[PDB]
A paper describes a structure:
Poxvirus encoded M2 protein is a member of the poxvirus immune evasion family and plays roles in host immunomodulation via the regulation of innate immune response mediated by the NF-κB pathway and adaptive immune response mediated by B7 ligands. Here we reveal that [name] M2, co-existing as a hexamer and a heptamer, recognizes human B7.1 and B7.2 (hB7.1/2) with high avidities. The binding of oligomeric [name] M2 interrupts the interactions of hB7.1/2 with CD28 and CTLA4 and subverts T cell activation mediated by B7.1/2 costimulatory signals. Cryo-EM structures of M2 in complex with hB7.1/2 show that M2 binds to the shallow concave face of hB7.1/2 and displays sterically competition with CD28 and CTLA4 for the binding to hB7.1/2.
Interestingly, two oligomeric states, hexamer and heptamer, were revealed in both cryo-EM samples, which were also observed in 2D class averages of M2 alone. We finally determined three complex structures, M2-hB7.1 hexamer, M2-hB7.2 hexamer, and M2-hB7.2 heptamer, at an overall resolution of 3.04, 2.7, and 3.12 Å, respectively. Unexpectedly, the cryo-EM analysis shows that M2 displays as hexamers and heptamers and binds to hB7.1/2 with both 6:6 and 7:7 stoichiometries. The resulting structures reveal that M2 forms an oligomeric ring structure with B7 proteins binding to the outer face of the M2 ring in a 1:1 stoichiometry. Despite the different oligomeric conformations, the overall structure of each M2 subunit and inter-subunit interactions from hexamer and heptamer structures are virtually identical. The root-mean-square deviation (r.m.s.d) is ~0.4 Å for all Cα atoms of M2 subunits of two oligomeric structures. The subtle differences arise from connecting loops that appear more dynamic owing to fewer protein-protein interactions. We found that the oligomeric M2 proteins can engage into hB7.1/2 with higher avidities than the monovalent interactions of M2 with hB7.1/2.
Numbering used by the authors:
A (entry chain J), B (entry chain K): 27 to 132
C (entry chain C), D (entry chain D): 20 to 220
Amino acid sequence: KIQAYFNETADLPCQFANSQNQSLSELVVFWQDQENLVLNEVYLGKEKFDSVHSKYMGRTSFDSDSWTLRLHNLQIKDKGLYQCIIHHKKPTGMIRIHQMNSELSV
Amino acid sequence: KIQAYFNETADLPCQFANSQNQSLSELVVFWQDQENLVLNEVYLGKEKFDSVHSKYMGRTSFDSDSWTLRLHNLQIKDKGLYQCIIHHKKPTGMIRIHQMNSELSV
Amino acid sequence: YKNTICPPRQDYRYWYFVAELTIGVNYDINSTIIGECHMSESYIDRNANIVLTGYGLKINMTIMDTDQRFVAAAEGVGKDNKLSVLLFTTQRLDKVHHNISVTITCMEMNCGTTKYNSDLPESIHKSSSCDITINGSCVTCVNLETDPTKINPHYLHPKNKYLYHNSEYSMRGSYGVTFIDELNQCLLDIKELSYDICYRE
Amino acid sequence: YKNTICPPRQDYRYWYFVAELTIGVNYDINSTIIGECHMSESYIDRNANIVLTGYGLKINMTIMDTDQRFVAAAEGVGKDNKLSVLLFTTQRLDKVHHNISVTITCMEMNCGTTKYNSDLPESIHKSSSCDITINGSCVTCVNLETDPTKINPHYLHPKNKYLYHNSEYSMRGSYGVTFIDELNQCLLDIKELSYDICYRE
């Protein structure tokens, strides 16, 4: 498990090894709270904000080269663990390939 | 059964015949009260005090040549029988080889 | 010395929480019906097998190369037409991940031939593969959490029985597939959920 | 004149307290279940034998070269997962120590092959040996006090029966083995203990 530091900027990495070495162009990359609210969404390289909850609306950033969510302006309430989920979109069916759970203490 | 005398020093002997003639280096030699509290412990020739009860803490002595516990500064409460138990430690399993029950009147 | 599986008995008093199956369906099930689920167990050639008939579905789930046999199952219906399945075996005598093969067939509503047959990886530790195959178009999504660290609180264990579950994260495994354009939604609401223990075995 | 063993009958009204088995287990048994233990007795070629199925264990304990046959057994569960077994034969017609062989197999939890097979001596008088063998890794420790001088006070004898126990220290025998790094701990807490008489014979 990976934790983050105090109220400046939290880093939430998925740490995908990418063993099959597929591209991000067909990959669904997203994060989620312990109370099971979606943080950010990536569908095919474009961020989608419809499933993002209003309490995390317009307050998170995504970096594709480092595969990391940057969580700005931390509050006292968000001390729970955050899990990032990586699905592989196929027209036959959407396959979850990677999940990881990290922590956040401020 | 063996008893001891008044309030000077009690002698509690195991009286091991040692018919197989094994050494004390792999032998677990210890004593216990009638209310089933450990008196002294010997693990492989070193006294261990973690399982020794606090009412008998720092008040007993062991003699290896005579295989005897010396019980100093007797009180009125300890008039019950005391039993000494001798286990043979093997890595497959710890085998009890000898027990004996003695008495104590002061 | 080798640990072996205990001999089969009529009633099993020690249960190990092995799996957490939340297969979703696009048809309506309103509530958990008492005495609906029927379970058939098998252990032939070191492969556990369980067949679950209930709530319009047959679940033929088998585990390869194990010393565990399925001894119990509890089925419940959550909100948004979600079918939670809890599975219990005897005991965990090994600390390795096991290969899983689950066949989900529709016996009501959208019955049909095989729509899906694939290998679902471990989401965590990437150490095993689930051979999933779905005989029907009636399944929304599949979520199988092998060896969970937490029991669902709405499941009331029997009084004369004993329950053990995994406490280490290293033995957790997650498999998931969705067939609709929603993130997750295999997970339940767990606000009003009730469980029923399957009938046979 | 030679004293012989009495002929077998359906119900035995005179019981002799012969043994005090406190086999410990690392799995949880919460309380004594009424009607759980099942005992099967045998006396073939001057060797008493008792098989005790209950609380996840089978106890095949036999005594060689005796004029006693096992007529009763009472099983109870103490604290810290301790299984106390009380054994009763007909009568003591000899004043010699008898060789004891006990097989303890796990029928639940940690089942497996033989982990232990040894000769446990008399702790007192060094006059006999117990051939112990354990089919499983589910046993913490074994304590067998043959011919005890004291009955456990929590065991309530039946009203129409009669109980006799040893009164001499010279006929006591103690066998013990531990497999964990604790002194003794085969002995029970005897604060809240209840006993159940086994079913058959």
